[PDB]
Symmetry: D2
């Protein structure tokens, strides 16, 4: 199998990398097989993962070895998730990580401020269409100096000592990077409202200055958000907690504004999904029915508003449900049910057996940490989709 | 001597780093001695240089070995300069380089777009006061993607295939980084006027949005520049060719707008120095007299660098850079002696020549015309007059 | 194709590595395909080649860039050859290289004394059955200190400033390393006879002390060689110029003693092949007829005497014919003829078309440097075989 | 101070290297000062240490972070010691380490078989007189393949999962490497007597084949050892546990055979020191009196190290190593003062305690029992008496 062949051919520079491979790569290869990637792409993505991602992952937290940097991306503190994005017809695999610098979580780098960009630089000489300009824009607007990073660490739990996260879509035959910047450290240290910071960073983008439609969409979103998030500097959910961009040509990149909140019920889902009554069309409502059904059939909730240059009008957000603490066999049975409801019979009929085969070392009827998040979306052009995020290390140990 | 001891202690990871050391470090150690740095700071800076700068300099261009990336920073194509900044009371040493990535000047990195930031990241875990926000801001506004970088290379000579360069001030026992971003590649690829792209990038700075005084100073500079630099997309002089920032807290960083031009005479000097009559105070006029005198005493373009600080509403006189490539270095030394006497810096005058010879022991500097590359002169209200002398260190050694 | 997929997935740390890949890896992948390696082994070997060999190859000599170290392994000074070993039924691909240290050919490393062992160390943590003890034994007996290496360089042409060479057999599904140590630098600097040095280094092996049969074989070989190679310190071919070992368990390793000479004619072939009349059996003679025929149908000639612990009796050597300067289309037509004579009809019928497909950038009817060496062997148990060494860079530029 | 300046100039590639520096370099700089190394040599050695030794030390074992490889070189499992060698006229500093590979103590490298050679290769391009031939010889004779290394790990406690270690003498402004190869893993895996495997490896040396005098000295040592060490395959004392060489021209290298044993009293000391009566000369007897006196003034095994040089036919007295782990370090300091007075080294006696406290400022050395780990004593016909004091530097700092 590719993951075994690459281990034979490449070995490992060090033991943490070897332990990362032994705890993730068989799962990754399985996901790729299940999603119908050809063998040549399996090799491509696994070889890429070996060379670029393994060294980015830092030490492998395990009994007796407590790293200096502890990630919020997973239950055991490992800076890695693997996700799938499921349509009617097809499934795409994606990696989410934090790239860990070698002084991360110590005085010289308290918020792991440098590793992700270093990874992106290696990707920019690897891949012709990687563009770092929006990364650099937002790193400039929300990043902090060393002293400020140290102040932020005294105000934040260990699992939130970060400023950026990276995801890599393994799509078509390419690697497509996207990043998310956190607003909280800058809000805490500057005592500036999260809302003001978020929109000020956005309004200073080059593309915002050139694109009237984006400015119109952003003004509707600010109207919607202003009354719903804090006006003061407090970290009171609901709040504008992340800004996401795609590492592509800025005029093509989707700009994402992510809300985090700890309350969700039907009223709130409806409010978020329709932007308080702004969106009342049939596509929107069909999406809403999906999301309501999913909630009935079934960490903060997330709401992600995505905007593109050239589009004046806002769409429904993607909504993220946290699943940590809920039985993974229950979740699987629920998703089978939801897939049937969506008419995705094939996905329903394979979901549970494929889930087990992804995570052979664990008994999913006994685990509660393997499914970590579920995202749901509905797009006027693309259709409905569902994003499932897995704590791959929890699924392997 | 420190440069020799460090060569013995540390060796070299490869032969290009060894050649960079054998052509630069003895000079650098000399400069630091001549500037009255203590032995401990000589070690600090030479060890820093070995660890951080040698790998950043890439291959050492030499007969039989042509790198893929050729720098415009020096005559022989070497991405390094060493400068001194001279006052009444003190002299400080500065390094200027381009950090060369390992695929620089090839399809995967046509304009060497990544090495300087990588160096800066390493400096940010080394030094507590290094700040990358303004670097990242301007890299975002004036940097180009790979395909654009490839287009730019078809429109620029090999020595101008760059977007950024870095200087490191070796001051107060610290290393203070500053960078300069080139506007030309973006201007060429986007067919936008240099003046428009320069000020649009500046106007999107976070600090510009928060600081009324900086906006006001910028606004006076634009009024001065707009009728003097092109309004079209042409690359013709005087032009806004570089944006400089200091890699420190954005609220403390000096923002620089550098003009390049070929034409200079006393009336242009006055125009640049006084911003066409805007500045008429005694300090300004005393400065002007100094700069005129230097010009009389004395091909690359002239430079004119307008430096602005958040919290300051008013423009000061720029620093003026005289290009010295092609002029005999013994003449330049005699000219500087003369100028130092005129400023009343007798001690600097009496040591300049002997010190120059001792900086460059492997070459006869009276026979060279490329060792002195630039001379910058400045006057400050609070700080006094200063002179910046930029040396092509490799031309001084090979 | 694997070589293209790996280039997409891995990129290159630097431009010399990229140029090595662009001048060799398509050829390598072609060789592996032609030899019926499965796709999974093609990936294994090409990924291995990317990770381990590319950085070992040093700079890529090209117009305007003259490295400090110039290899004798190829016509353009590149430290690389690809060879095939052909039987009746099957063909095996092998890599020959010098691993170039980053100070090679300069005062701090005048004879490139360190790179090969550094490569072997990385292989010893990659591959479970790699054994370095014989490497270290011979490096101890024939290696030189810095001053001695500098003296040797004043007495040797630039293309012979080396002490070790490495080959990697890509066999079964493994990588099997072998090395060759040169005796000449130590002979020159110490003014010791090459014969004395060679046998003294051998007689100090641990396995020689434990294995009576090897000592008996070695005593017959010394009897045969003593009158034929110099008794003085001169570098007068015929001479004992290399010692070869396999980097495996010393009790399994073949020990090789390689003679170089500039004269070969029928008398001498017969003398070398039969060890001056010692070997007169039917297998030996059948081998001799092969070798004579090959010579008629068609750098020093080489003669390689291989011995194994547990075997008291010497076998016929492998004989190496240099082909540099001879037309590569002529060579191909000759080999087709020789293959037919051996009854290897299938090999004959595909040789020329496969050769062209290995080296598509060149016209083999116009080149004289692509075939560099040919080795012929006959083994009592294994049968006849032929080793063809290609200047892969000459075949690509 | 140099250790601080280098930390400022160089920083650290990772947090384990930073912790190694923060627990060792201040001590090391102190030792070098105390030994009257000039500031330039202090820089030379501390910069060398930063570049070459810090990466070789692997992870810094500490609460919450357990490495895969645990060294027997120190009490806390840290692969580092610092020693001083004291004469009448001078004191020199030595580093002892294991160079830890990145897969050490795991399936791909169970006995850390590659790191020390890799360090030595880097030293061989750094320093002109470093020679790897004897290293490679003994690595060939006593080193093991992966499967054998895995077998050995099942028969040895974690702290003895090693085959080699390295010392670096910081002498004459140079770095002089030496190594010690363990015989036990080969003895265990092959079930061969340690005595037989030790001498078979020695007897295959190129220099042994060329040097009649060394063979003769070896022959006298074997006669002495054969009735004292086991004839069977057992790992019981006194045993031939290490072979030491200097990484120099084989014809100049001292070959060492190190015995380990637990039992010592005055009659055993005499036996080891005189080789059971073989040596009876005045120098030898004067040495013996010294060593007896030290023993009276004063768990790891005792060591006895027999050092032989090509061209010398006759055996000299060994160096004897007293194990000091578990004994109070204030007592040891008082004992050494007493011994120094007895040797007539008044100045060394008068400074020993104060200097010890200044070497280890972060710990109260009067409360510790692991900081002094070994004390070696030697007498040489030509050179005089000497004392080697080995410190667990990390135990002196944490
Ligand atoms: C770890 C935190 C803060 C939230 C977990 C959920 C998460 C990382 C959503 C990322 S948005 P994304 O995966 O990029 O959604 P798509 O546009 O790729 O479909
Ligand atoms: C314009 C071209 C071709 C190269 C750049 C010229 C150059 C080295 C400008 C340096 S300005 P700088 O050294 O930063 O002067 P200060 O403001 O530090 O006094
Ligand atoms: C470059 C020089 C000195 C000779 C060229 C021929 C050469 C390298 C023969 C190697 S012997 P080898 O390839 O290992 O023969 P096999 O036992 O592998 O069949
Ligand atoms: C025997 C065990 C458990 C560890 C080795 C003990 C050790 C550090 C011996 C060093 S002998 P050494 O420092 O080389 O003495 P010198 O001959 O240099 O005077």
């Amino acid at each position: 199998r590719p993951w075994q062949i690459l281990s034979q051919a490449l070995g490992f520079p060090n033991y943490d990398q070897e332990l990362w491979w032994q705890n993730t790569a068989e799962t990754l290869n399985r996901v790729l097989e299940q999603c119908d990637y050809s063998v040549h792409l399996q090799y491509k993505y696994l070889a890429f993962y070996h060379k670029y991602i393994l060294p980015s992952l830092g030490p492998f937290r395990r009994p007796g070895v407590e790293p200096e940097y502890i990630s919020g991306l997973s239950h055991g503190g490992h800076p890695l998730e693997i996700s799938v994005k499921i349509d009617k017809s097809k499934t795409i695999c994606r990696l989410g990580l934090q790239a860990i610098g070698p002084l991360a979580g110590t005085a010289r780098d308290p918020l792991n401020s440098f590793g992700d960009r270093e990874l992106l630089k290696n990707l920019a000489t690897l891949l012709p269409h990687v563009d770092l300009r929006l990364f650099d824009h937002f790193n400039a607007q929300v990043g902090l100096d060393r002293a400020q990073c140290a102040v932020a660490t005294t105000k934040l739990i260990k699992e939130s000592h970060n400023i950026v996260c990276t995801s890599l879509d393994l799509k078509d035959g390419e690697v497509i990077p996207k990043v998310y910047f956190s607003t909280i450290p800058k809000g805490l240290v500057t005592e500036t409202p999260l809302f003001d910071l978020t929109f000020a960073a956005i309004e200073q983008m080059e593309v915002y200055h050139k694109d009237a439609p984006l400015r119109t969409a952003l003004s509707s979103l600010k109207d919607f958000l202003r009354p719903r998030v804090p006006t003061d500097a407090s970290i009171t959910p609901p709040l504008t907690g992340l800004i996401g961009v795609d590492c592509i040509d800025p005029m093509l990149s989707r700009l994402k504004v992510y809300l985090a909140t700890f309350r969700m019920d039907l009223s709130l889902i409806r409010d978020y999904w329709t932007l308080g009554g702004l969106l009342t069309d049939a596509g929107t409502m069909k999406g809403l029915e999906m999301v309501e059904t999913l909630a009935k059939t079934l960490l903060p909730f997330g709401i992600n508003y995505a905007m593109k240059p050239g589009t004046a009008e806002l769409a429904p957000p993607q909504i993220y449900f946290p699943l940590l603490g809920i039985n993974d066999g229950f979740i699987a049975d629920a998703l089978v049910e939801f897939f049937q409801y969506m008419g995705w019979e094939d996905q329903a009929n394979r979901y549970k057996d494929e889930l087990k085969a992804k995570f052979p070392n664990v008994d999913i009827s006994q685990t509660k940490n393997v499914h970590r998040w579920l995202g749901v979306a509905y797009s006027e052009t693309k259709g409905p989709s569902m994003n499932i995020y897995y704590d791959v290390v929890a699924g392997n140990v």
